[PDB]
Amino acid sequence: KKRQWALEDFEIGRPLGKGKFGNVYLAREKQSKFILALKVLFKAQLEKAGVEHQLRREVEIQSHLRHPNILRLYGYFHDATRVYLILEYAPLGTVYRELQKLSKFDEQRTATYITELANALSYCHSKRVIHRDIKPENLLLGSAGELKIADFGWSVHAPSSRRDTLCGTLDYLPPEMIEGRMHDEKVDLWSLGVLCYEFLVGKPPFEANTYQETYKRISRVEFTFPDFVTEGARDLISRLLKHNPSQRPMLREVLEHPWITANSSK
Numbered sequence: 001k002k003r004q005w006a007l008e009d010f011e012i013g014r015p016l017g018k019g020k021f022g023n024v025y026l027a028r029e030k031q032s033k034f035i036l037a038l039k040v041l042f043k044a045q046l047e048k049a050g051v052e053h054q055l056r057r058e059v060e061i062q063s064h065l066r067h068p069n070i071l072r073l074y075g076y077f078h079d080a081t082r083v084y085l086i087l088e089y090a091p092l093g094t095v096y097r098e099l100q101k102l103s104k105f106d107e108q109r110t111a112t113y114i115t116e117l118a119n120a121l122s123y124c125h126s127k128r129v130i131h132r133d134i135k136p137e138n139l140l141l142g143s144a145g146e147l148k149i150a151d152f153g154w155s156v157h158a159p160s161s162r163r164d165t166l167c168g169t170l171d172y173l174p175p176e177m178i179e180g181r182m183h184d185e186k187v188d189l190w191s192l193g194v195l196c197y198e199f200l201v202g203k204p205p206f207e208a209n210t211y212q213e214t215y216k217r218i219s220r221v222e223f224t225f226p227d228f229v230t231e232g233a234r235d236l237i238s239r240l241l242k243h244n245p246s247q248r249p250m251l252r253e254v255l256e257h258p259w260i261t262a263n264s265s266k
């Protein structure tokens, strides 16, 4: 990746956007006619929240990761006014929207998503990138309907003692992160359990009307299963959600889970 870019190299298409501060557009590189996505950040209000470092941590990390289940960052550039991210384009949109449409996923689609998820996380963790942000909004779908992890901004190098003032809900964060303690790869396995629950139920297991009561339910790990959640699903989710990070299973055990292997296409 020697080549450096400019807006004049791209034709801007449909807004996919309003993208976590400023939007994501379909775009086509003029010479190759290569279709991709452009994330656009005005840079004044990225500066004003002092995220300028966290953004280039996202850029650096997501740059060196090559996995079929991880969204590519090809490069980036800037002019005086703002900063641009050149990203792999995921044609089928966000998992979040698919979940709004179906309202919940069956066991086969869910198990497949989890499998793809664990695979990408195995890869991330081998490099000791831990995502820590995993949620349906950060998940994209490729042309074959395969899951793709995006938005690595909050991702870190393990272990982390990090301060990192918290934003998005509390819903996907485990007790060790919300209580401000040391944490490791096991963070992502908790998020995986939260995600698996949400996929099948249509709602995250600790969901509540206030930030403060969500904190409570996460700390005390209080969640209940609707009747239609099968025994094998409950088992995997119950294993994933454990106050003690060390009681959480390895991604390998997840991939070898009888409920996973039964319903997974993969």
Ligand SMILES: O=C(O)c1ccc(Nc2nccc(Nc3ccccc3-c3ccccc3)n2)cc1
Pocket (backbone or CB within 6 Å): 016, 017, 018, 019, 020, 024, 037, 087, 088, 089, 090, 091, 092, 093, 094, 097, 137, 138, 139, 140, 150, 151
């Ligand atoms: O709605 C559609 O038609 C649609 C079709 C194809 C898409 N595919 C796509 N491809 C690459 C990046 C990207 N970003 C986002 C765009 C909109 C909303 C959220 C994100 C995002 C997701 C994860 C992390 C960061 C940003 N979206 C996206 C939407």
